[PDB]
Design a binder for these strands. Sequence first.
RNA 1: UUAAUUUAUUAAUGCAAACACCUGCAUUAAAAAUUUCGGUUGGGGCGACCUCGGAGCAGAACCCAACCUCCGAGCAGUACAUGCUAAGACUUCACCAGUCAAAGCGAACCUCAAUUGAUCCAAUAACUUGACCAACGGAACAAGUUACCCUAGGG
RNA 2: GCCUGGUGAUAGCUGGUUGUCCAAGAUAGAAUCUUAGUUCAACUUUAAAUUUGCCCACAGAACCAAAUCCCCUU
RNA 3: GCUAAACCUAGCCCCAAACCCACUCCACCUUACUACCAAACCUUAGCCAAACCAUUUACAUAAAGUAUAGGCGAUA
Lengths: 110, 49, 64, 243, 95, 95
Amino acid sequence: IPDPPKHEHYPTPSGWQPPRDPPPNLPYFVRRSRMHNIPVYKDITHGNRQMTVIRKVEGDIWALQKDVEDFLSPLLGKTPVTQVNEVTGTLRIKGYFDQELKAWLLEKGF
Amino acid sequence: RLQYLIDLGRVDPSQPIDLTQLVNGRGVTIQPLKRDYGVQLVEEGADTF
Amino acid sequence: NFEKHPKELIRGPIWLRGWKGNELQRCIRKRKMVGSRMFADDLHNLNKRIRYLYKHFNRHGKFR
Amino acid sequence: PLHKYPVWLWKRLQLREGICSRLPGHYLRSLEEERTPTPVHYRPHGAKFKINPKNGQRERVEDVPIPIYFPPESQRGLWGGEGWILGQIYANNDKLSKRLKKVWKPQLFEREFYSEILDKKFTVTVTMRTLDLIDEAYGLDFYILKTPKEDLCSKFGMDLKRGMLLRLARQDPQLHPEDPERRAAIYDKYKEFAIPEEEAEWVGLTLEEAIEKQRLLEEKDPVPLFKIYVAELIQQLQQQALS
Amino acid sequence: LTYFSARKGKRKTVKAVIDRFLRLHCGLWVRRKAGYKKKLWKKTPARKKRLREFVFCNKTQSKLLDKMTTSFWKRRNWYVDDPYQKYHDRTNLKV
Amino acid sequence: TVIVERWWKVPLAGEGRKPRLHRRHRVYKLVEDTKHRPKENLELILTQSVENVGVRGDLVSVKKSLGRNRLLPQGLAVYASPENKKLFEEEKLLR
RNA sequence: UUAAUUUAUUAAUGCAAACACCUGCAUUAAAAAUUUCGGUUGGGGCGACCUCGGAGCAGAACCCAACCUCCGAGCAGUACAUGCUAAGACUUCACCAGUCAAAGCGAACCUCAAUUGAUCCAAUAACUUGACCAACGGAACAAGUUACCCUAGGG
RNA sequence: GCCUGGUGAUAGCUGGUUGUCCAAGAUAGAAUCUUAGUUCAACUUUAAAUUUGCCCACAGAACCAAAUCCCCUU
RNA sequence: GCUAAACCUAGCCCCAAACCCACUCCACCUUACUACCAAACCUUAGCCAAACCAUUUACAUAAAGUAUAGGCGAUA
Ligand SMILES: [Mg+2]
Ligand SMILES: [Mg+2]
Ligand SMILES: [Mg+2]
Ligand SMILES: [Mg+2]
Ligand SMILES: [Mg+2]
Ligand SMILES: [Mg+2]
Ligand SMILES: [Mg+2]
Ligand SMILES: [Mg+2]
Ligand SMILES: [Mg+2]
Ligand SMILES: [Mg+2]
Ligand SMILES: [Mg+2]
C-alpha cells in the first residue's frame, strides 16, 4: 500500500492528516493502520453493547486509560467504564466515542 | 470515498480513472458474478470534493 | 514467495488433501472424486452410508 | 482399496492387451467412435441457445435423445433409426394421475428390394421411415452405402454394406458375368464409395466376430524346430564358408 | 429443510419463503397480507386499505425465515432503481 | 414413426458430459405420430408408356403406394435424382 | 363392493396406417391393481355434535371450562366519494386474521351482533371472481368389515 | 413359504442413555386427521443494554358478595 | 487354596503406489471331479419422506444451493 503523498496544507479535503514528526513524548504511543488511519473502531455485540476500541496501543496502556478516562468524563459526567487489554495492547470503552477519540488522538499527535 | 482515495495516493488523478484503477487501488471491490455491472458514482460528499 | 501453499505439503487420500468436512461431506467427496475406481462392495457400502447419513442429518436431531 | 483405472475404462483397456490389439487400426477406430445418430423419435431443438418466455433470458439448450430399444428382429431386418420406445405416461396427460408404463412399437412391413450391386432380391422387414429414407437416398444401394453404421442400426444392413463394399473393392466379374458393360456401369454409378479391400473386409464386424477373423488370420501350424535349426546351421556353415 | 444436500453437502433454501417474503438487509422480513385479493366485494374500504399493505414480520417469524434461507439471500444488493432501497439500513434506533 | 417428448425437463449437462437421467425422465408424452400425417407424393421419371399417370421420359409425382409397389420394382420408373434428370434432358435433346 | 383412482393387462368394437394379422389413437367390458375408511366421547357404541355471535355460569378491570343452561347466525336493506391517503391505538390469551381512527388530498353541504373461508391453483386484456373446502387453520381426489386378523403399546 | 438383498426399512410407541461438585428452575392458553404428538405463546435459563419494577392513597371505572383494576407516597 | 486370573502377537483396518489372477501328470457341465458315438439381451420395483397418501421423494474449487423444476409442498 503506497505512502500517502505530501500535501501543501493539512488537513486534506477528506480530513486525513499525517502523524506529526517528531513523535510526541507521551508515555504511550498509538500506531496508525496499514491505511494510515488512526485506529479507533466501533464494536457492537449482543445487539446493544455499543463500545469502542483503541487498538494498536504500544507502551503504557494505563496512562492511556487515565487520559481517555479524564477526557471522556465531562462528556458523560461519570468516568467511562473501560477495559485495558495489556497483552494485545487494546483499550475498550463502553459507548461509541469514535469520532471524539479520533479527533482527540489527532490533537495528541498520533 | 474517491476524494479519500486520491488524498492517500491510492488513485492517481493525473491519469484516467478507469475501473481497473479503482480496483488496483482497492477503492472498490466489484464482483461480476453476483451480477454487479460496475460502479455508480454517488453524490455523497459533493461539497468538499 | 507464495509459490506453494502449505496444503500442498500434506499427503493422504486424494479426496482430502487440503479439505475438511463432516462425515456426510467426506463420503460425498470420496464418491465423486474416487468412487469410479472404488471396489464394488465398498462403493455399495459407501452409497448406503450416504443414504443413511442423509436421512440422519436432515431428519433427526434436537435443534431446528 | 482402489483400482488403478476406473471401471468404465476397463473395456477400453481390453482393446490394448491381447488379441484385440492386433486388429487393424481402421477397425478399432470404427469401434472407438461415438458420433450420435439422427433423431428419429424426438424433435431436435433448432439451435444451441434459446430465449425462454418465462424470464426472457437466452438459456442454452441441449437435446437429450430418447432411449430406443431394438429387439433382435430389428437386426434381422432393416428398420430405420428406430425401434421400441419403452417409457411411461401420465394417464390423461396431467401429472396428477397414475404414472403407468407404455411401449411404442413401430409399424413393420415385409417388403422386398433389389440390390443392383449384389444383384439380388431380398425380403426385408422394413418400416415406413426406412422406405422414405430409401427414396431420399435414391436406392437401397445408396441407402446402405451412405448411411452411417450408427444411424443405420442393423447388423443385416451392415452386412449388406460389407457385401456391396467388397463387391466394389474387388471390381468383381461375378456381378454380371458375360455382360461387362453392365458391370462397369453399375461399378461406375457407385464410384463414390471406393474403399480398399483391406478395409472393406472389416466393415460392420462385431468385436467378437473380428476377434474370430483375426484369430483365423494369425493361426498357424507351428514351424518344426528342425527347419529353424537347419536354417541357423546352414547360415553358420555359410559364415564358415566365407571365412 | 435440507441441512446437508446429497450433491454439495450445503444447506438449501426453502423456495416458498423466497416466493412470498422480502428480506431487508437490516433483518426485517416484509410480507403481503393474507387474503388481500379475495372477496373484495364484501370488505369495507378500511379493511381493503389494511390488506393492501406491506407488513413487517414478527421476531420469531423473522428468525424462522432466516433459518429457511441461505446467506445468498442475506446479502447487500445495490440494484439500479430499487423501490425498497431506502428501507435497508435502519435509521435512528436507540436499541 | 412416433415422436415423443419428455414431460420432466432434463438438467443440462455441459459440453463434454452426458446428461445423467432420473426415473422421471422416462415419462414421455406423445407429441406426434408420423403415420397420421398428410402423405406426400414422390417424383419419378417413367421409362415406359405406363398408364394414364404419364408417358415415356416424363417426370411425374405419384402416390407412394403405386410408386414403390408397381412402378419402381418393375423398372417402369427411375428416381428423380440429379443424375438421371441429366440423362433425360439429354435424351430429350436427341429427338 | 355401487369407496376413491387407473386400464398398464386381456377381449371386443370404431377410426387411421397397410394392401385378416400387425402398428397407432380412442371407446366399452372383464380381470384386476393402487390407496383409504376424520374427530368429541365420564372404557367404547347409538344418539347428538364439529364454525361464528349474545346471555348465565363468570354478581364489581380483563380472562375462565363442561356430551353445562338458554337464544341466535351462515343475511337482508340503503347508498354509489361503500374515493385516495395517514398520526396514534385496540385485539379473542400465539400466529394468521380481525377492529377503531384524528390530520390531509378530493368531494358533499352506512344500519345490523353474528351475517363467514387461508395458500396454491383456475377463469379474466385488466379490474376482479372462484368452495355446506360446514370435519368451517381447509390433504387436489380414497367405503364397509376381520371370532383368521397382525404388530407396537395403554388399562 | 423360506432365504438373500433394498435395510441401520419405518415406529408420534415401549425400553435404555455411563465421572464429580455447585448454581438457577413447576401448571395461562391457541391451532392441529388433534387430544400417546407437534407448532406458537406462557413459564423457565444464560448473556447484554438500560431504567424503573413490586407494595400501593386520594380521585376514578353502568345502566339494565369476597374482592379486582388504576395508583403517588412509602 | 481351589476354580481361576494375568499376558503380545497371530493377524487385521484405513491410505498410498501399482492396472491382478489363472495348463506338473490325470479327472471335471452325465448323478461335476466319469477314457471313448448321430441357446444371450426386453424401463427395476418398492422401502422410505411428504408427519395420511394418490403426482412427487437426493443415489478439485467456484459460479451456487443461483437459474430452474415442484400435489409451486415435501423436496429436487
Ligand atoms: Mg465487532
Ligand atoms: Mg392478544
Ligand atoms: Mg378438521
Ligand atoms: Mg378445524
Ligand atoms: Mg428405529
Ligand atoms: Mg409416529
Ligand atoms: Mg438450588
Ligand atoms: Mg385438517
Ligand atoms: Mg401422538
Ligand atoms: Mg405509575
Ligand atoms: Mg409417509
